[PDB]
């Protein structure tokens, strides 16, 4: 099954917008983690494939997903990086869990319609 870029934009970008709309939880995910700004030089020792909302949005805008599961996988890469690097008590970690709950609800009917 071949998916057109605008078909993927129209279907998937609302699920990404739902994540952006989460306040306070989306704020640290709207731009790439910057270990220099944050003073965490070990970040890229632990996270080998960084991901964030702005990168996912650019990939969707530029047709880099051929197939909707590739988009789902990048969203979960974002989540898994945050749960891997951050402490269980940290805001980023708890905010990530909220973003995953929101994403689960938004993506479910969308994937069904893309099938
Ligand atoms: C240019 O915009 C800015 C640049 C950077 C800022 N940034 C902060 C700042 C640093 C100062 C202390 C503080 O408290 N920060 C802070 C913490 C939060 C928290 F989410 F923890 F509540 C929210 C905010 C904000 F966005 F409201 F401003 C700032 N720490 C971050 C952690 C991550 C992260 C992830 C994901 N994975 O691993 C990590 C690590 C990513 C971004 C972060 C967010 C926005």
Domains in the chain and their CATH numbers?
1-114 (1.20.920.10)
Stretch (H or E) spanning 112: helix 91-113
Q: Is 60 left (phi over 0), alpha (psi -120 to 50) or beta?
A: alpha
20 to 27, 90, 99, 114: CA distances (angstroms): 8, 20, 9, 22
Angstrom resolution of this structure: 1.6
Residue among 13, 16, 19, 5 at smallest CA distance from 101: 19
* Count of C-beta atoms within a 10 Å radius of residue 19: 22
Confirm or reject: Cβ of 33 under 6 Å from ligand 1.
yes
Can you tell me which atom of ligand 1 is nearest the CA of 40? 40
Pairwise CA distance, residues 51 & 75, whole Å:
8
What is the DSSP track for 84-99? HHS-TTSHHHHHHHHH
- The CB of 80 under 6 Å from ligand 1? The reply is no
22 lines ligand 1 (CB under 6 A): no
């Amino acid at each position: 099954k071949i998916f057109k870029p605008e078909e993927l934009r129209q279907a998937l970008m609302p699920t990404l917008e739902a994540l952006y709309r989460q306040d306070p939880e989306s704020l640290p995910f709207r731009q790439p983690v910057d270990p220099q700004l944050l003073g965490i030089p070990d970040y890229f020792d632990i996270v080998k494939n960084p991901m964030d909302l702005s990168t996912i949005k650019r990939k969707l805008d530029t047709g880099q997903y051929q197939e909707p599961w590739q988009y789902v996988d990048d969203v979960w890469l974002m989540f898994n990086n945050a749960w891997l690097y951050n402490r269980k008590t940290s805001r980023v970690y708890k905010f990530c869990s909220k973003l995953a709950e929101v994403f689960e609800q938004e993506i479910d009917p969308v994937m069904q319609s893309l099938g």
